[PDB]
Amino acid sequence: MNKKELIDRVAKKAGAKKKDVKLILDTILETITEALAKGEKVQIVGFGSFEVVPKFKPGKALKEKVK
Amino acid sequence: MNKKELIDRVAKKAGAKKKDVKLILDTILETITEALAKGEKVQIVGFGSFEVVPKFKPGKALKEKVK
């Protein structure tokens, strides 16, 4: 799946306009990038953590769902 | 930063209600998790790709921004 398909799937599931999903997705990605640029960690419970080269550490729950 | 702080930062930047940002963020995480559970790749231009254990490969743009 690419970014466009991700936006369409999320807009359908949440009952949201694609333009609002794109704004919020882009703002999420910009916020995570800015945090990593300052050396901060972005820890999302039930998914994983982004830290700094950028690295992603999957959470227990994600690993179990993908296992 | 944790998930709550991420939601608050994105809601301020996008001028969106925190409940709407949480709904869209959770739906994005659920959508990525479901794709990975089916063995699909989630490739987001200008950020990176999630693929399958779950792995994240940072994009060129993200690597340049955090170097």
Side-chain angles (χ1 to χ4, degrees), chain B:
Chain B
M1 169 181 323
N2 59 20
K3 184 184 179 178
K4 181 175 180 182
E5 182 178 37
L6 174 64
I7 287 165
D8 285 352
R9 292 187 179 296
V10 170
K12 182 196 175 143
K13 299 176 182 193
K17 291 176 175 154
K18 291 173 190 199
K19 69 164 158 203
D20 291 329
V21 171
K22 187 180 175 176
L23 170 67
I24 280 165
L25 173 59
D26 281 350
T27 303
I28 291 163
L29 301 172
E30 193 173 358
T31 301
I32 293 172
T33 296
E34 286 174 8
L36 294 178
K38 293 189 219 171
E40 194 173 357
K41 186 170 192 188
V42 179
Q43 193 134 24
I44 300 167
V45 55
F47 188 75
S49 54
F50 293 87
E51 66 188 2
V52 177
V53 310
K55 173 157 206 168
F56 175 74
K57 176 173 147 203
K60 299 191 179 179
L62 176 59
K63 284 154 141 189
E64 306 171 1
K65 278 178 227 176
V66 306
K67 72 183 180 180

Side-chain angles (χ1 to χ4, degrees), chain A residues 1 13 34 41 43 65, chain B residues 1 13 33-34 41:
Chain A
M1 162 178 335
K13 292 181 191 191
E34 290 166 16
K41 146 182 237 163
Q43 191 131 30
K65 181 180 181 179
Chain B
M1 169 181 323
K13 299 176 182 193
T33 296
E34 286 174 8
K41 186 170 192 188

